[PDB]
Amino acid sequence: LAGKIMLQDVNTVQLARVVNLAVPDTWMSLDFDSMFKHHVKLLPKDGRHLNTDIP
C-alpha cells in the first residue's frame, strides 16, 4: 500500500484533507463534482501567465 500510495493519484477531495479542507454541509444537496471538474479553470482565459505556473 505504501508503494502504491507513493505514486498513486487521488481526487481533489482526498487531497484537500492535508490542509483540513472539507466540503460545506450546505453543498451536499448540489452537484459539486461537475463544478470541481469542468467549471473551475486553473488556466488564465487569455493564455499562459508566468506567475500562474504550478511546479
List contacts with another protein (CB under 8 A). Answer: 45-50, 53-54
Shortest Å, Cβ 50 to another protein: 7
**Dihedral sign (CA 35, 14, 18, 43):** negative
Shortest Å, Cβ 45 to another protein: 6
CA 31/CA 10 separation, integer angstroms? 19
Nearer to another protein, 3 or 55 (CB): 55
Nearer to another protein, 4 or 41 (CB): 41
Residue 21 in contact with residue 27, Cβ under 8 Å? no
